Amino acid sequence: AMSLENVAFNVVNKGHFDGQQGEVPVSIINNTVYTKVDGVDVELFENKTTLPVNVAFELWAKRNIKPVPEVKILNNLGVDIAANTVIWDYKRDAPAHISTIGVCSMTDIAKKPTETICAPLTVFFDGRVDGQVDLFRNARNGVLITEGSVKGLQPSVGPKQASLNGVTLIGEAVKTQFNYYKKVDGVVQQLPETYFTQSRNLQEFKPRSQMEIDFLELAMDEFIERYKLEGYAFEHIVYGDFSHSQLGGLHLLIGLAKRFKESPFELEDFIPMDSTVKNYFITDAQTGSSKCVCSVIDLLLDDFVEIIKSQDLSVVSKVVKVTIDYTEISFMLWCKDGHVETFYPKLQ
Amino acid sequence: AMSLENVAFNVVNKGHFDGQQGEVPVSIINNTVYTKVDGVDVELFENKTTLPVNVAFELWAKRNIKPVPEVKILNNLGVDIAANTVIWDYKRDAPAHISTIGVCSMTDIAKKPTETICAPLTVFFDGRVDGQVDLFRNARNGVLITEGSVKGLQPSVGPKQASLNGVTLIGEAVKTQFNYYKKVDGVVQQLPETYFTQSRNLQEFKPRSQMEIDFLELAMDEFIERYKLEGYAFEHIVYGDFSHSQLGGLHLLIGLAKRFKESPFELEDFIPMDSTVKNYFITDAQTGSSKCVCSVIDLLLDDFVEIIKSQDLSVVSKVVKVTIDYTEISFMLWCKDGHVETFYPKLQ
Amino acid sequence: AMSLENVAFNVVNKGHFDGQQGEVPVSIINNTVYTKVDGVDVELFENKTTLPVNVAFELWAKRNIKPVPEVKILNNLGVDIAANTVIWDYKRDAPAHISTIGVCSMTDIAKKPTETICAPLTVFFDGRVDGQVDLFRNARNGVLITEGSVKGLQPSVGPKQASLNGVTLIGEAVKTQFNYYKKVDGVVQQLPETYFTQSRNLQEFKPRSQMEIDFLELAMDEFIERYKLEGYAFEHIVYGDFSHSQLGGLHLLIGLAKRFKESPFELEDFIPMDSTVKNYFITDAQTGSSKCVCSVIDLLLDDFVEIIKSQDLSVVSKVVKVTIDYTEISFMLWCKDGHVETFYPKLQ
Amino acid sequence: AMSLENVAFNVVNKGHFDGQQGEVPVSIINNTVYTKVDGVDVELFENKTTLPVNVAFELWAKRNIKPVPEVKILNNLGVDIAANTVIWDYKRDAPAHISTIGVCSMTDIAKKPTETICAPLTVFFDGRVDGQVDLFRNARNGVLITEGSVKGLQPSVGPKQASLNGVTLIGEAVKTQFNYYKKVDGVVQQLPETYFTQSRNLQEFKPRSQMEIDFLELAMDEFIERYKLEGYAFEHIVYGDFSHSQLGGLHLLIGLAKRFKESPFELEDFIPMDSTVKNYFITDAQTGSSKCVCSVIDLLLDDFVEIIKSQDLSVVSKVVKVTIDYTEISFMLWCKDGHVETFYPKLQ
Amino acid sequence: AMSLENVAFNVVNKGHFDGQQGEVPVSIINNTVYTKVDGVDVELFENKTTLPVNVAFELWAKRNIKPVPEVKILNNLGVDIAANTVIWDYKRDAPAHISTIGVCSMTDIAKKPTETICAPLTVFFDGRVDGQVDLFRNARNGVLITEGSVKGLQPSVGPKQASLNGVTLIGEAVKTQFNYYKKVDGVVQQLPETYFTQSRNLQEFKPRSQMEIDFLELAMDEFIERYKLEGYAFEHIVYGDFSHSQLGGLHLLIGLAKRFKESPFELEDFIPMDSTVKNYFITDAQTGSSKCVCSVIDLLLDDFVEIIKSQDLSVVSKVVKVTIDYTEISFMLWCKDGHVETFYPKLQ
Lengths: 348, 348, 348, 348, 348
Ligand SMILES: Fc1ccc(CNCc2ccccc2)cc1
Ligand SMILES: Fc1ccc(CNCc2ccccc2)cc1
Ligand SMILES: Fc1ccc(CNCc2ccccc2)cc1
Ligand SMILES: Fc1ccc(CNCc2ccccc2)cc1
Ligand SMILES: Fc1ccc(CNCc2ccccc2)cc1
Fold this sequence. Notes:
Largest interface: B-C, 34 and 36 residues
EC number of A, B, C, D, E: 3.1.-.-
Oligomer: part of a larger assembly
PDB class: hydrolase/hydrolase inhibitor
Entry title: PanDDA analysis group deposition -- Crystal Structure of SARS-CoV-2 NendoU in complex with Z2856434783
Chains A, B, C, D, E: Uridylate-specific endoribonuclease
Organism of A, B, C, D, E: Severe acute respiratory syndrome coronavirus 2
Bound molecules: N-benzyl-1-(4-fluorophenyl)methanamine
Distance between the termini of chain A: 47 Å
């Protein structure tokens, strides 16, 4: 017995849709959902999605309030829909999927993922929910996350971090590291050996290794000397080159964070969404150096060092493919006389 | 247990809100209420009101589908709100009243007209509903319509016509003529002696007396001779004067209807609402004569002749107040040498 | 090379999208698509769909401008999507299907109906287009219309009428009667024996048989005597019963059209869409008789007489299922002492 | 002292902006301007323009309520702006010009047409307004309409018809035929010899010559014999050819009007604006014949016969340029063995 | 070959419109431009302008991504339009000019600034673009910025700072100080000797002279003693007077910045735009002192000291006109017994 007034009642008294019974007066004026509280209209939800206001309101209310995989991971693993839940994309203020399975009468393509309409879709199953592991086994295409082992199925250990209500974190009171499983056309497909991005903020950056603690504390010349990174172009790639009108390098987020405490800069996120490699139109406020498309990845500095110090440096220009967050991130490695010149996450 | 989906279910399966149980998927895109019918969004309601889309949707669904007094009569009798119903203003595509009594949680000022909030409002009571006559007796201010006689109360016989779902008609299968009662500050008022407008369409005009049958059939000179209307300016007032750049007269709808069969014309209803006297920016397509504000009343021709012959014709210009549809309509009577020049419903 | 400006160029110079090259300046203000014509913004399209303005603009521009099956027939045959065309629903001012195959990059689920995403959808194939008959043979689910005979396949002769640009007509200069074929899970289905609705307007009604010519010309008592329809309740079912406050019967459009010449009435199409049985909130302007849900079907009078005389009249109330426009329409047959009382298209 | 509330006061009490003083409460909800009338919001204006709601409201209120040249004539004469008035385009529900001279503070480029900003614009001057003829003399570019003769200036007699409040008419109580004058770069131009379109409706068509009276009354074979039009392709050009799937000809509105009495048809005005030649996506309801772009001109039949008989019929295909409504209209004349095949207003 | 999809393709792959070829799917829902990225709609632009969504999208995409003069400077110099570029007003989230020259088909008044329509407009020319200096020479009215000297033309050295992508900065890797030239009616007009505002933030304030370093470090009494500013009312003008219910003075931004580190305050920018003198409705959170219109200018403290210590202090109240950012900023100087009382940027 689903209604706009019942969804709004749950939002008011529970913080989200909890399945409780009751109704509150609701008014819809344009893209905002209001509720009458003692004679005054109070704002409950503002629709920033491409879905009707009341439909988006309900999907937001029915969002998954448990630690869930980050949207970048589920996209990298080809997820089209989520089974009996709404994975909310907080980076886009909209559902990660536009169609649902057993969530909202307006977006539901099916009530159960067993329906033949779901067959060609990679459905996401949450093993922490009863019967979801069995549904993964019966579905043609899908992705499964589990807290433990699923008998017979070879797991892929995922990232330490999951997104809890938009807050990406490594769980202390909750489990955020999941075992991942994928199926394509009924066959369990083996997930590749992968690196993971650390999902850190530029303004809230914290080092997660001694190399990262040393990068932010030590100066450019002594860090490169301490970690033997001579001839690997860290001065351009990680640190940046703001001397000319076009910003040079600055492809690792640790280098951007080190730069941010000295000089502020405008990172224009021209495609606001979650991805393994993010692109920004950067403008440096101190020098006036700028780059229209500055591809930035947040790898653990040790992992970027392991990738860069595992490449052949004798080719003028070659594509270096690396598996990060399950997807193959192609990099452009440029060399000269046995030393690196640049190594950026190649733009496609 | 009121909801958007339940109101929409009733609209789909019953034509209006009938109190039935059930829900249909609803989507709100801007000011339109849609419903999913076999995978396609079908339009259910387009909000032309100043109220939120879903609030207006519900009040429209909960509209009174019985013959009710025309909004002009209800305004003339100073009604503010309706008791336990929604009088829908089809001429404005909105409720006749913005606040309700026991209809919608969003517009309800009270659940029962007995509440002290209703005390200063002239509440409309429908005698055909059980207990509404008793509520009129207990209310401080109000208007009551009844099909029969009320104990002790002296009635006022209203118009022959009522509005059934926007279609104004004189009932054959239903009763449309009501007894009217009014109360101001607890005191049963004596309603005035009044004329009634006939509420006819220009394109669907039908004569309702031998004088009206003769007006439309006979020529100007013959009709005025037959009914001895010489010196009463019917040639200007009723028939019209399209010889100059400014349209002369044409204040009675019977003369507009006679004119409409011969030559078409543009009536610009610049204030779309129901009123005893309607104003139109008229442009005659044949001659090119026009009038910015052409006040038109639809009186029975016999009633207009009775009013015009009941006047003193010795004043150059005087205001002639006539009680029509219970309200006092001011007319401007202009005379010259004992004869009328014009008699129009005063632009005030 | 698809763009908003190119679609708009085609609309301006060709009347619809014809694949021509060129661009015109376009401006989008809210839900309207405008074009600059000599310095003035001219309206090109107003979006009445649930899709983004520019997406709907393109699908409308790319609509099928050839006689196509009526949306009621296509729904009745369970069609989900059209192959390499846009069937435009003129009764809803929106595409008949929200997803396309090889039409618009925004709505396209696939470029060709052979893609595995189309497999569970009943794709509509137009035999008049090269290679569409072969695609029907290869598709798992689908509906096929052809002007001629298909090798091996047993046809179903459809309605005489098709919809050409929203104008339903029986072709004289074009062919509008199609052979229909259906496939479910790869198996060519045997379509049922069906009656067809005549798709006539209330205001533009024309008789299509001597019985219909006699119905509109003769009086109630004479027609029923001439065609020996005594005891079949035609006086209530077809003609109508406007004597009481609730309109009795009036389920056949021929009786509504006969009534319309004498007295006008308000048909409130509360679910604006194309269907075999249409429901209307009717209000008769002469009597004041009304019905919230008045189910109306436009069968050829001969076909309704053949259906009503092919029934057992000994049950107080039974459901009579009739295959009309390929779908099973349930009727409610009410009898008393061997005679009919009512026979309406069941409100279910 | 201009305000939204004062414009709205004038609209309510005068039908349009008359310069009167006073204010009424106004509320703006989205694109509609409402006014509070006795506690209920009444709609005053719905913005169908590309301008802000209140700006468009004011320009509409300040529209020219005198017979003015039709927007097709004003465009043909290359007018950009009107001097101290608003020419309202009723075919587009918007001002004919987006910028004003002494009308609205929001759209005003200048308070007087003498300002140097107006210098490169062809300003329209209405001779019926005091001082407008003198302003035409002083302006660099402009168009002037007058009821009488202007000293020294050689006139161009315009169309018999002008547009009075959207109603195109030939004045009986007003003058609608104007003398036209044009100036380009300070030089009084000699306007060309021109034909005029008759600006008639398809549904409200009236013949304006004996040839037009004979066209609508006589049959195709009789009319062509009476007026000796053998070999001029009137059977295709004027009458139409609905035998094939593509509608043949039908370029003259008199032939469309003759056709309309017999069979109805859908004229899709895909570019809603006023022009000398109008294009329509036509669909004939009887035959099912259709044409994506059917160019239609309303010339007096005598003028079309004078044009078609004034041509050389020995070229397979040539462009025939005709001055109509002051603009050069290109026609495509197709001949074969000394006879016409088609002569349509060229799709360019 | 300009299109919405091509502009959106450039925004996605280049950060701005770079002239590249290609298209991405675009959807417009209300005032937001979305793009389909792997089946999910990602937001690309939200229209905060008074222009149509797609028109504003294109002008924003085509914005000048080089250091350009600040909008306050170009307004002060009377600029109406920019030649073959879009100067984007980041303080208003809209183009600095509503009409373009060779940028967008919808906003273009001309393709080249040489067109006679541009003649009365002060067109902005960027000398850094090939042929723009020659176009300035040929234009009737205009403003020209150059990095070097233009033979014969007497330059005006502009501000040290220019706006690079909304970030106002003094160039280190780019040149931000330009030579300015102006022409009025074909004549090169001599630019006045002017002071420049420093364009600093209240929250991000940095001193740019020893006097400013001393103002923020030293207390009120020792700064005024060190710089001999006794009897010049710096205690009221620069520092502020929060003792009464109406805030006293606080007209220099350096004084506001000094105050901000001690006590926070609400600066209500009631006219959000770039100007030499900014007005704010200030409310001091600590004391509760407030001023409806508090005019604030950011002059270098040395320049304000040079202006105040160059005035005659014997008049009770006089207007002191000073040229700042090329425009004459009139100040109100109030004196008493040879000492200043107040000196604020006079409100007009
Ligand atoms: F839970 C969900 C998480 C993410 C999504 C959207 N992923 C779209 C995609 C599909 C195929 C390949 C790459 C991306 C949908 C639901
Ligand atoms: F049923 C209804 C019918 C009419 C109304 C609105 N009447 C407004 C009014 C109030 C006082 C004097 C004049 C007009 C409200 C409900
Ligand atoms: F051409 C088209 C015509 C019609 C449609 C929509 N039919 C929806 C439907 C699906 C299943 C059963 C009943 C109705 C889609 C495309
Ligand atoms: F009164 C008016 C009537 C018409 C207009 C608009 N005419 C636009 C145009 C300009 C140049 C050539 C062709 C068309 C503006 C005001
Ligand atoms: F690049 C541009 C920068 C600024 C503008 C807007 N300046 C408007 C103005 C005009 C006259 C005097 C004062 C202000 C337009 C384009």
